[PDB]
Symmetry: D2
Subunit: 347 residues, 4 copies
């Protein structure tokens, strides 16, 4: 019934060959779900873990991926709150000691023993994966496993970020990078949560797309020469919260100048070796807050997933084969980052 | 090394004999600590579980107790954040599904599958007990295991309660029942947390004891005929928060009338079949809040335990033998509830 | 310029005969505005005042009303941020000391010196009345004064209570009396603020109205044997918040038992001599919260009016004569108002 | 009655010559008090004003000072809650519009119409000055005006920042420049509010002073090679909060890296043209918060003065002549002030 062999996209070296091939089916432990993965999300994070850019050592031979949507096929004796057949979601955060200051506060991310899918643990580019029964998303029955896989990283994240911005219904939120993978989700979660949405992005088509998902006010950065000035103009003081999901330092630092007084600019985008250098006078005189926001926790997960379940949030995906993958890892270099890729494991 | 037999205080019937006798050493599971219990707290809750007053069915044959302080002697393969020798604490809340709305928010108490020490699971009146590795308190090395056992229920609880009152340093807090088991801990946690402490209790000696642990203002309920009036007088508006830890309905309802406007009265004491009947006009006109507060969670635990570790909180205990116990269960009826009892398991 | 005699509805002794008749125009004090009142909402508070339903005495003879919208025709020597001609709003809280701890913190309505329109200060049921300038709603030019009127007590009250319930977009809120004046506006503020809306009401066209305004789940109190269990089942475990905007004791009572674990019932409705009786055991084990909420502050007001301007809230009104007041009270006290009545002061 | 000429310290052009000399007594406006100023603290802000260190221009010629304590000798026609003879306190925020969204919410100091003592309005470095009545600290009778003076900017500022750091009793707070004017008072407000206090400073008798006032852990910046790692080790993983009350860029910088995970660095200190440069990767992965805090509001003020009255805070002062001001600025800008200087206006 459960096979011993399966297909996966492994690699035997830091920045080396990307062999799609037959590998073992991993056994699960007493705390783990055996998940038959149907679709795996794909984003730039999986390109970095491959290279060895981040300095934490990598678990070679390693199956990347951290956005797996699938089905509970087996489980360790001690697993709880899980039936066979349940739909299960594998996130960046695979596991945690569950016995430290941080793990107790739902800040399992900052756990010194953070187990990470597609990095220290074998991720979601394979037909069968193990996961911690606790951290695994509980996907409700009747949800397109393809469509949801993007929610499992970018969606949780942008939702958590949005709570962290610390807003009320009726407040303005600026999404800096609002036609991007993260931006366009941010825009929908923002709208569903009661907020007024202004947006910043550039060039061909990105404005019509923004409107078509409920954005109110667009600031074309290519045409508009004084971004701050318009943002202030448009919000009659400056945006109450701000989400930074561009890949541009300039645009982050701009954020400290268009955010409102008593307001909160939030860091999600982590451009390579970037630094946010805010003027101290401005920041004190206006009691401005600058908050970083990492992945989410079990609660954030459940919530983020309910808006999707309510149909209030959707990702414009496009599905390709799991054997295809090296091309995608290749295209991510070449520049053809463009829309949300998801991988079928049957192919 | 680890024995197969040990002593424990069991019972084979709802409200029956209380045989101190040799019983098995339980095996632990993969998620559990084997704890060699050195001292167990004792309170009225353990008297109720015995009778069958609470309507949830009881796990006969059952070893009561929910305040165990001891030592990690073994552990299941999958346990994490636990070394052998570590000091471990067994609480009312033994375990939880760790996969529901509530378990994800640190409200494991309200879990439908709440596993409870000294009720559905075998508690802390025995030399060796099993516990969930996750929920178990991590007691720091160099803490009197005798002295701490009271912290594991009344202390966590009164601390959690105090946060729930939702106060600032410099605000007044009223402890209603401030020379009692819970009251006198409440008084110390209150002081350590920055609050100004007023107190209410009655009769022989209870005022000198109150002062001797840092209480500012005492209202003798036996002498003072208009409690509300004095409390208002003394706080120049009414106490900002209030803790109810008396065993008296009258005194709870009094609380809704001496609590300040915008303030918060908190329910901890659960007198048998009692009801809090607040005047609706008063409560609206003054935006008063009435909050129930159950046991604490892993975080509350760690925090509560740090003040003890800092020596800022102490319980006037008195140690007796584990064989003694039926007498104590007997004395709790007879009326000789009087000071904090703790049980040595070597006796 | 400004006339001397005017039309008002006045009552000379408690529960007296409502007299529609020529009366003095009032003189503004130095901090006060005179306001030509054009329309005013009719609130159940006003009925409770006419009936003598609350402990506080009225100021006889009394002109009730505190949902009054009008223009500035005059003002006192000391008034700051207002021109003659502006639109102004007269609410429950006429004014306050803006100088004690409560007023400092925003809780202006809990000022022990609070002056109340339509109870201790002749309110808005007349063509000319006065209001303190610092607490008076600034209403944007080109606002329909007949339509805006009910935001000034119904709308801000319920908006503030909703913030007081500690909800999150996605959560369930139960609205007890969801087709009343406050209820109907609660439903819209709740929809707009990202919550899922359940409501309880009864009588002709109530459900019909609830559905038209954005209501998800209706429970007719006329048909449903088990209110409590129906809310439980609908919410799948209890409503995260509840807003009591009935005029009923048994409603209030039940909201203590259909609230969710870690949920919050907000008291708002003030039936005569009514009391909230909550089982202590239950409130404590579930850590349920019970909170009274009292109108809104300047900020709440600002915010509540902005939702209106955006077209997201809309009190269902019928505009009749000020001389028609007795028919409104007659028909209010029989359940039969469906939303709100406002009075044209010229008729 | 009230004199015409008085003694003041005045400067005519930026960074000019400080002139101690006979000058007009000022006339109160209708909402303003005249205050006989007896003593005033000397704050580094005043130095930054004299030097022209910030973007905002001064109001030349300027009498600095905004820690001024005095009695009411007169007031305007429109003043409400004050008698002649009362004690009054003149702070940074002279007054504000008490009528925009910011002022409505408590954030009075972020009013775009804010009037500033000792920058845009002749402050407290003279025997007579004026202040808006609604924002002026009410100081209890029998308060030592020389001693209370520094609460009026140092003390409330640091107390408000501490609330802005989101601490809990038990948590660690690092105070950067803990032996300065603000630092020394921060240390006491922190002790009183239940926090464990670490501080960083340097120069003669600084450590000595830090220990006398309740400091737990000192780090001399003069001796310690590794500031960052020393804070990390002391806190066992980072300070839960940090308060930047230095006048240094490199201090600020380091507070971004010795803050705890999910911790909060509060910006307060305003070195000229200074900037806060935080590594985005780090801020995000740890979800660190960076927050500016700007003086205090009426409520903060009230609260901060109450700590004083209870004897739990005490600025270490030395009282010299108002004509001595240049020696204070001379010695402030060399690190050498140990706590605070206040000026006797009569000398
Ligand atoms: N915080 C976390 O936990 C977390 C998790 C995963 C990924 N990420 C990060 O998310 C980031 C963004 O990913 P993405 O796929 O959304 O990017 P993307 O390339 O799909 O979109 C980026 C968008 O930013 C826009 N942009 C460029 N310059 C701009 C400017 N000056 N102002 C406004 N917009 C501008 C682009 O036009 C584009 O629409 C990455 O840096 C990645 O590291 C963060
Ligand atoms: N919320 C929870 O999670 C939780 C957990 C465990 C126990 N409890 C409860 O704690 C309660 C108290 O236990 P205890 O051992 O502290 O009681 P105790 O008998 O030791 O002390 C009660 C005190 O209340 C005083 N008292 C009596 N009438 C009073 C009045 N009118 N005003 C003020 N004080 C008055 C007594 O004089 C006494 O000092 C019990 O009802 C128990 O069920 C609650
Ligand atoms: N706390 C505050 O700040 C505040 C502010 C304004 C009004 N109020 C009070 O709120 C109450 C409601 O005011 P209104 O003017 O909206 O009243 P209203 O009479 O216009 O509407 C009351 C609604 O309650 C409903 N109701 C009756 N029995 C019920 C039951 N068993 N369950 C559920 N609903 C039931 C009615 O059908 C009706 O639609 C009054 O007591 C009023 O004084 C309080
Ligand atoms: N944000 C606000 O609301 C607010 C309010 C008042 C003052 N301030 C500002 O705060 C700053 C401090 O004010 P003050 O009057 O207390 O200053 P002060 O000069 O009296 O004290 C400054 C302290 O910083 C210390 N210091 C110097 N180098 C340091 C280093 N590398 N690390 C740590 N500490 C160091 C000094 O030794 C000194 O004790 C000023 O810039 C002032 O303008 C801000
Ligand atoms: Zn991803
Ligand atoms: Zn951990
Ligand atoms: Zn107990
Ligand atoms: Zn659970
Ligand atoms: Zn007041
Ligand atoms: Zn009303
Ligand atoms: Zn203002
Ligand atoms: Zn200052």
């Amino acid at each position: 019934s459960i096979p011993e062999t399966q297909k996966g996209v492994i690699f035997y070296e830091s920045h080396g060959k990307l062999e799609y091939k037959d590998i073992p089916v991993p056994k699960p432990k007493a705390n783990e779900l055996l998940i038959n993965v149907k679709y795996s999300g794909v984003c730039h994070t999986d390109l970095h873990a491959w290279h060895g850019d981040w300095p934490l050592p990598v678990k070679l031979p390693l199956v990347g991926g951290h956005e797996g949507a699938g089905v509970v096929v087996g489980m360790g004796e001690n697993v709880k709150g899980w039936k066979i057949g349940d739909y299960a979601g594998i996130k960046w955060l695979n596991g945690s000691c569950m016995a430290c200051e941080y793990c107790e506060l739902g800040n399992e991310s900052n756990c010194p023993h953070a187990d990470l899918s597609g990095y220290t643990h074998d991720g979601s580019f394979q037909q069968y994966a193990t996961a911690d029964a606790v951290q695994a998303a509980h996907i409700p029955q009747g949800t397109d496993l393809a469509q949801v896989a993007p929610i499992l990283c970018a969606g949780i994240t942008v939702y958590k970020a949005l709570k962290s911005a610390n807003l009320m219904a009726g407040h303005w939120v600026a999404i800096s990078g609002a036609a991007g993978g993260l931006g366009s989700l941010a825009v929908q979660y923002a709208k569903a949560m009661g907020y007024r949405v202004l947006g910043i992005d550039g060039g061909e088509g990105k404005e019509e797309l923004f409107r078509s998902i409920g954005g109110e006010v667009f600031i074309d950065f290519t045409k508009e020469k004084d971004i701050v000035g318009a943002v202030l103009k448009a919000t009659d003081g400056g945006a109450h919260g701000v989400i930074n999901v561009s890949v541009s330092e300039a645009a982050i630092e701009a954020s400290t100048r268009y955010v409102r007084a008593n307001g909160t600019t939030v860091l999600v985008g982590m451009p390579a070796g970037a630094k946010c250098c805010s003027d101290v006078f401005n920041q004190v005189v206006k009691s401005i807050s600058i908050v970083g926001s990492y992945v989410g926790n079990r609660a954030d997960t459940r919530e983020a997933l309910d808006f999707f379940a309510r149909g209030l949030v959707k990702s414009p995906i496009k599905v390709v084969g799991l054997s295809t993958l090296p091309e995608i890892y290749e295209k991510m270099e070449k520049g053809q980052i463009v829309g949300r890729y998801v991988v079928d494991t049957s192919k």
